[PDB]
Amino acid sequence: ALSLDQRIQTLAYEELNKAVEYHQAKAGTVVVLDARTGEILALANTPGRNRAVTDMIEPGSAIKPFVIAKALDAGKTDLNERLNTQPYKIGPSPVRDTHVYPSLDVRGIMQKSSNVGTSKLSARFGAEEMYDFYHELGIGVRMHSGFPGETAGLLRNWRRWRPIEQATMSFGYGLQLSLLQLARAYTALTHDGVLLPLSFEKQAVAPQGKRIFKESTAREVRNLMVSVTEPGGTGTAGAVDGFDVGAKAGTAKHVATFIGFAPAKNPRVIVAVTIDEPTAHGYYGGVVAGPPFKKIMGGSLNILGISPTKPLTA
Template sequence: MRTSYSAHQRERLADASPALKMTAGRVRFVLLMLGMLFLALIGRAIYLQVVQQDFLQGQGEARFRRAMTLEANRGVITDRNGEPLAISSPVQTIWASPADMEPVPPAKLRDLGKLLDMAPEELATKLSDRKKEFVYIKRQINPEVADKVIALGIPGIAKQQEYRRFYPAGEIISHIIGFTGVDGKGQEGVELAREKMLSGKDGRRVVIKDRRGHIIEDVAAIEPPRDGQTLALAVDHRIQYLAYREIKAAVEENKAKAGSVVVLDAKTGELLALANYPSFNPNNRVGTTPEMLRNRAVIDLFEPGSTMKPLSISLALEHGKANVNTVLDTHSYMIGPATIRDVSAQPSLNILGIIQKSSNVGTSKLALLSSPQDFWTYYDSLGFGRAPNTGFPGEAAGRLRDWKNWRPIEQATMSFGYGVSVSLLQMARAYTIFTNDGVMLPISLYKTSTPMPGKRVLSEKTAHEMHDLLVANSEPGGGAVGGRIIGYSIGGKSGTARKLEGRTYVANKHRALFMGFAPGKNPKLIVAVMIDEPTAGKYYGGAISAPVFSQVAGGALRVLNVQPDEPSNNSLLPDSTPVPADF
């Protein structure tokens, strides 16, 4: 049925049509916008879940996933008898992740500071950078202290195990062993030289941690650490103790600047002891100065004075320029404008007399019988001017000038230990030619089952002749009587060298030296001693360095159970008066 409207109703409907039409348009617009927004949300979800999935997952894991280093235990260093000289003890390190932390309340910071012996301001500074996900708070602390830190319950503070190096012998052997830094890497000595062998390889563990640093789960296979290897040195800690005790006492007694002693196995070249004073404590290096860190026996160079004479005289014997019965005129003589003289002048001396009286005149005349090239070649064969390749970091090569630039006076002075620079370790090695039938042995820092092959420098005949001359030098009338040992024979040579300052040899600064071997008849040990700038009155090597040789060598022979080769009542003949012949 058709509806009919009155005129008034039709007028009202006509007035309402535009409003209805407008409302419908608004609805369509809102629906369209809602649809577009919904599509945008779906698109964003698809983008995040598909396109950005790896990035977002990485960001989440960066907040809670941690790759932990499993520190390898550094290898133990022992002496030749298995006595530990360097070991690693487990300690704890406190670290934090500022990016995962809320500001720490002041009271908590104060408590943390008391445990770690740190100022709250210092702690606040370490924790202030919210972009950092890892920062060390304090390393290598006592595990009990670390447990108390964790018990404070500060979110973002955690601990991890590390190892701290400990040296049972302390300053006694520090110049050989060296030390490691806070990161556990070698800084000096054998610790540095054998870093790769000792350090091993760290492991790795990837875990999920909560904000308190607690491990929730492992998310990858654990890579276990591979510990460092044990390293056995040639050193005998008992002989090392003797060497350090005696050189320290001698330096203090003679008010010297410093001193060093080297002990070698006379038949293998193994380094049984090396001690310097001053020294340092590797367990606590607070207050350690560069002078205390110097491994003087290895890196310090000096002119060896009269201890060089047995070596240079041997060349004349080797080349047949002289024999043990040769007698030389030992009056002072001139080389150009320079005068060669002896402090204790003698009109003539045979070879033994030249050694006993430490004659510069006799030694230089024998040296000048050889050509400069032959003399240089011989010194070069003894290793002078070249690093000894022991493996010690920073070992010195010394100084031996090219023979083409020599003048006769220079060859003469080099024969009695001036104009050539060496280390104490080099001099000790050179003396192995007198204990090993003319073969110079390489020095070994490490215990060896088979001695390393040496290099022939002299014939057996010459080596035996000089060996016997040095033994005779320890008898009454010789310059080595101060080094004698009750119950044992010895062979040796003392020396005293003035120090060079600028271009001038000063009269009041000396180095006192003694090189020798024991027992004299069948040498087991070579001991080299150097005392730098003694100022207590005595300064001759025969007076202050020879007694150090006697104490170290004698004690070492007894430690090694070497049978005496002389009666136990053989008397010491101390060098009670200065021996000018040392020059």
Template sequence: MLIRNEYKPYMAKKEEKKQIVVENNKRLGWLLLAISGAFAVLVGYSFVVQANHHDELSKFSDNRVVRSIREPALRGTITDRNGTILAVSRYLKVATFNPKAIYAPKRVGDPINWNVISNEQFEKMAELLKLPEQEIRQKLKDRSSQYVQFKTELSLEEADALKALKIPTLRFEERTERTYPTAHLFSHIVGFANSKGVGLEGLERVENERLKGEDGQQVVLRDRHQNIVELIDSPENTIAKSGETLVLSVDSNIQQLARTQLAETLKHFNAKAGGAVVLDAQTGEILAMSSLPDYDANFYQAYPEDSLRNFAVGVTMEPGSVMKPFVVAKALDDGKVGRNTWFKTTPYKVGNKTIRDTHKSDALTTEGILQKSSNVGTSYIAAMYPNEELHEHFSAIGFGKKTQSGVSGEQSLPIKPAERWTKLDRAVISYGYSISANLLQLAQAYTIFTTDGKLMPATIYKQKRHTEGTQILKPETARQMREMMISITQKGGTGQAGAVVGYDVAAKTGTARKVSDTGGYEGKYRASFVGFAPAKNPRLIVAITIDEPSGNGYYGGTVAGPAFSKIMGGSLKILGVKPTYLTAEQQINLPTSADINMKPEPIEEQ
């Protein structure tokens, strides 16, 4: 069959297209073959390099290492009620260098350049690091070392000054420093934390979790010399969070006053130790708590262990006659006695012991029992009650258990079970023997007199809202006790040395013999004074105990009374509490009505 000529060109083009496709496929095949060959060569080369240069590659991997560095958190600040800083942390920087890299030649074969750091730079470094210049030179020129750390802790300002010198390889490691600006003043309350930021004593230990904060972290790239090459943006990066700020109830001015007077008293009476507590009479807030001996919290390691003990809470003692108001108050509250009920107060025997008074009298009223501090009279009142009822009363006031004030190191001994009390136990407990308390427990217990009969819990923290106390006495009983206890600081009372000019003061003295290590009572004493003012509308409670006074007396009124007067009087002035009466001198100096054309206004009770 013949093919027409007009179809021949079409068939030729078709043959040409097939030939072009074949050629293209051949070229693609050769290209793929070439790529595969090149890949095989690269794979083979990588194995050769890995086998022949393993050490070099390992070193190179070590030259760039991703690490996380700790960003330390600042511990929370501790302040007094007015914002005065008692404990604070700040950042410090420690300088580190890589001596081997400082002087390394820029190119292989070049000599070591020992003039990288000038004499002037060395001189300024020595000044900032507070180290001998020769020591710095020696360490930085030791090319066998790749890491040198200078122990000097630099402030941020000092670190910036060192950085400005542009010393090669300089980097900083960050630390935190805890400081106590008031040194000795609040050491027993605040305590201290160690160099690792762990609280070891005081509130630093008790509130460690609240104070320590949360460390942050930063992901970085380090070179083989551990120098930070780059900060890496990573989801693992976290910002350090400072610890919580603690606001305490204490007042620095009152604390300083209390410590000063306590120190003078210990020196004057050559005493072993002592404590003073100042409470807000209405809220139970601790405005001051001083104990001696004490220590500087910034250098706590330099002091003996005994100095770390907070005498105001860490020592339990038989309180002596400062316990008497609690027995009298209960009898008044129950209607068993009145203010003017008479009691025979001549010595009498209970078993083999004779109960007697230091200030002898044949008979005293209930108020007289307090004013003259009669052991006989108080023991007669206690005999009106069964053991269980008195035990319950003392427990309700807070004896035999810790105050839960937040102050660390508190010690407390349980009250002897009522079923084990003998008649002698009941008698001596009424005037402060065979029962133990620490100084803060005593101060707290006196709140039942300063409020409308409520026990206000003592606290070391500034209160944001009023705390409801526990009702112990009827309001009218508390008011009557306040009036009766004023007589103790007036003429004829045992606490006249504790009087404060311009203010009515209600108080109670206490003198207790100390138990010896072998049992029985030795010829050593603790002298105490606890009271409040202004008596009819109390603002403050002050409690003082002096341990083992000697040479100049040992009675509570004589030893602790003058310190009480100065602490109470000074504290009332610091708080701006108005006097409750005018002295004779003040009355003489009052302006006349002619001077001001009007009658002088009476002094209002605060």
């Protein structure tokens, strides 16, 4: 039986369509997954091809949590280390954040979505090691959905990586994956370190996945991601009243992305939104894709009957 939840699919289409029209965008896509089983609860596209599976995107900041999780999982950093986060170059190419942060701890690197912090964490691993990690998340691996135009994504051979390229990949540029591949990757965080396959069929139990991170790492990383949606974080537009939300906003003509899960401690749902070429009222992920994320997330939690874990303000 088909995994789509008609009430969540209707909600996803409603909110996706409102955002595309408001931002006078070319197109958009939403994926909603069950965060414990990998079942696809909603898959909505604006008219035309199934962009969720056909359109390769550079993930931008949405890849950062995985790099941080890897460095924690292998013991290459911990929650006490403060890193020098000044911008730098490798040859002629700069690596820089939106702002100049002198130093940040790992929780700060997540909260402020630091390109510098994340690239320095990635640099503690060899290129081959990082390449295998990206591969293991599913990047460059076809999903075989059967939809016309489906992309495998792009993961260049590690033998060709320059140091600048390893750095930029760690903050989400120079590799490419579909929104469906990216939403899949987030199951490694939500399902306590275990990547799930995804399914269009209803799953009576969670299927067999594969371990990417230790459970303790996945839990700690989910907790770090909560600071992104709280004041001081880069993803406050995706806050949902009454819940802790872990999310990232991303930008890559532009593509605006926002992806997240809730409740943060024990996730029920992943919601991922891309808006293609917004031309009005903003073009960054948080401004553009944050609001429909927020509405699809809060709406799905209500549909699925998940009680608020903290007090309602509004």
